[PDB]
Design a protein around this ligand. Structure first.
Ligand SMILES: COc1cc(Cc2c[nH+]c(N)nc2N)cc(OCCC[C@@H](CCC(=O)[O-])C(=O)[O-])c1Br
Length: 162
């Protein structure tokens, strides 16, 4: 299982139910880090995607609303239904794309961290969840410089130690 996210310097992830920034290079990497996989999102992060569902992946939407309708997405109500879906498909990797209430609900079962780190600081209201960064190694780090310098970003792959 991987966590897919992008933060600012301080660990901010969201503002007012949307992204605090617009970064196109990172949302092209959101597409193709999840083209083909089982993508898990909380119900609020699903509703804030422009296309609903976004294509070519399984979108799994976690919601406590028994009646919630998302045509073409896998609508489930608890974590044990996400893993009971992921057990049915042994060839598709599980990717937890957020927000903060879903990254709490799979905190214990993550093995990889796919972080984008923005060099700047943005205003918002949601942070990334606290994680034991000492339990993971940074394997791979690739920087991309943007002509807005707050938007210069590093893509970092972390993998959990034995
Ligand atoms: C709510 O706002 C968003 C937040 C994210 C969240 C997010 C972004 N980036 C990263 N790396 N981690 C995240 N958790 C993704 C997203 O759409 C991904 C869009 C993929 C599009 C192509 C987008 C593009 O043209 O760049 C597609 O059609 O597959 C949107 Br819109």
């Amino acid at each position: 299982t991987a966590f897919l996210w992008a933060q600012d310097r301080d660990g901010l992830i969201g503002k007012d139910g949307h992204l605090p920034w617009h970064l196109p290079d990172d949302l092209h990497y959101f597409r193709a880090q999840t083209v083909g996989k089982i993508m898990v999102v909380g119900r609020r992060t699903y509703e804030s995607f422009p296309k609903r569902p976004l294509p070519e992946r399984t979108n799994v939407v976690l919601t406590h609303q028994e009646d919630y309708q998302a045509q073409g997405a896998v609508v489930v109500h608890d974590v044990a239904a996400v893993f009971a879906y992921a057990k049915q498909h042994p060839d598709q990797e599980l990717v937890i794309a957020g927000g903060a209430q879903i990254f709490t609900a799979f905190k214990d079962d993550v093995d990889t961290l796919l972080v984008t780190r923005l060099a700047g600081s943005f205003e918002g209201d949601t942070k990334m969840i606290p994680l034991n960064w000492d339990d993971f190694t940074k394997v791979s780090s690739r920087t991309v410089e943007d002509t807005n310098p707050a938007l210069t970003h590093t893509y970092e792959v972390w993998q959990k130690k034995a």
